[PDB]
Tab-separated table of C-alpha atoms in Angstrom:
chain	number	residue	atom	x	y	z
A	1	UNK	CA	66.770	242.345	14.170
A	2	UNK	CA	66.314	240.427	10.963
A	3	UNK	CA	70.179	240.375	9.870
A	4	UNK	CA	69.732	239.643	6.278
A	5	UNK	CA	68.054	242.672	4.208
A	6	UNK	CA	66.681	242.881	0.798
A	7	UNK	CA	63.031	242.223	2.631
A	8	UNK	CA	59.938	244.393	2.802
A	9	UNK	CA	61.029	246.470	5.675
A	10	UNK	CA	57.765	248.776	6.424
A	11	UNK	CA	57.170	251.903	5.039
A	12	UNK	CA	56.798	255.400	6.063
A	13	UNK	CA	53.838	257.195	7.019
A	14	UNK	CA	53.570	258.193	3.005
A	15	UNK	CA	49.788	257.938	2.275
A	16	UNK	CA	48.828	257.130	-1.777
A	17	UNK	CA	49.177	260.321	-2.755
A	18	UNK	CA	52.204	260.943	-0.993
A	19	UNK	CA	53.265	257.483	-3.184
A	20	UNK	CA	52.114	258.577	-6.643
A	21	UNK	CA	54.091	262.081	-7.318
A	22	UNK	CA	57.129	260.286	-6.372
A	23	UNK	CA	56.545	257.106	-8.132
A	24	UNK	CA	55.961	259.299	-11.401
A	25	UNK	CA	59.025	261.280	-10.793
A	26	UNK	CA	61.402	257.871	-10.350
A	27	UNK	CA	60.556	257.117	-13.897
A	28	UNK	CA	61.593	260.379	-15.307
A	29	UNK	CA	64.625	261.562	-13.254
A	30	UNK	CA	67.452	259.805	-11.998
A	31	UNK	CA	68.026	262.434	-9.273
A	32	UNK	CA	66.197	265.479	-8.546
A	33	UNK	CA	68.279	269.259	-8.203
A	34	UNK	CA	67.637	270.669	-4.497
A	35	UNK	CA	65.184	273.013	-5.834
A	36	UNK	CA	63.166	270.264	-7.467
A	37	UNK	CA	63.194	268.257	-3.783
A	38	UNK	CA	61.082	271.099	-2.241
A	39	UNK	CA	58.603	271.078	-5.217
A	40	UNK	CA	58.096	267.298	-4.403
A	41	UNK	CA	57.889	268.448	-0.486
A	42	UNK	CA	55.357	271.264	-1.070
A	43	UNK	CA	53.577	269.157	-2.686
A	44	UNK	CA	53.282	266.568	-0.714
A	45	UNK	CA	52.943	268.345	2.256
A	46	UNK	CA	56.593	266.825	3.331
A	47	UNK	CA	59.982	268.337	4.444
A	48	UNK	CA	62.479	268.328	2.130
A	49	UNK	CA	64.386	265.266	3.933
A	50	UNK	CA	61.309	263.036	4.083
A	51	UNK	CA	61.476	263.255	0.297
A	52	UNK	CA	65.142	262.001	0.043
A	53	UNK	CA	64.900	259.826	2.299
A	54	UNK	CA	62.382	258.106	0.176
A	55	UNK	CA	63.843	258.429	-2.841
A	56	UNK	CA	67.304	257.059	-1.693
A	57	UNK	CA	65.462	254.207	-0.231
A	58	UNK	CA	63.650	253.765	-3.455
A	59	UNK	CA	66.423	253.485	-5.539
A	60	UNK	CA	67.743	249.975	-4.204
A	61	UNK	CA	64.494	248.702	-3.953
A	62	UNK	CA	63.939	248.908	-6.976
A	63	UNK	CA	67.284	248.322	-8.095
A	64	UNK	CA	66.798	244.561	-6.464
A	65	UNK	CA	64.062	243.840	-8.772
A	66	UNK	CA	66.471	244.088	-11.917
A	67	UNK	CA	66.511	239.811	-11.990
A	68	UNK	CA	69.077	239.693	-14.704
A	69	UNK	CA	72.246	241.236	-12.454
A	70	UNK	CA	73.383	237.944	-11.883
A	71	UNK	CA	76.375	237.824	-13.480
């Protein structure tokens, strides 16, 4: 449904806190090690795969926003 993309599809059940750690961490690394993915699980109180599935889905969005990909 919706055949188009690039639109605010939802979230996950993330709640603000859940948001910040990984918000902070998207400015500093590009991709976390395996290791560093269960830190930002622990912490969170999230499996490790919650946490990349955000990430990966973070990525793009944020990717969009870069206005000046034109070409």
């Amino acid at each position: 449904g919706a055949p188009g993309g690039k639109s605010r599809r939802r979230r996950t059940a993330f709640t603000s806190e859940q948001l910040l750690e990984l918000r902070k961490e998207f400015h500093c690394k590009k991709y976390l090690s395996l290791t560093e993915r269960s830190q930002i699980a622990h912490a969170l109180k999230l499996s490790e795969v919650q946490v990349k599935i955000w990430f990966q889905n973070e990525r793009a969005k944020w990717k969009r926003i870069k206005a000046g990909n034109v070409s």
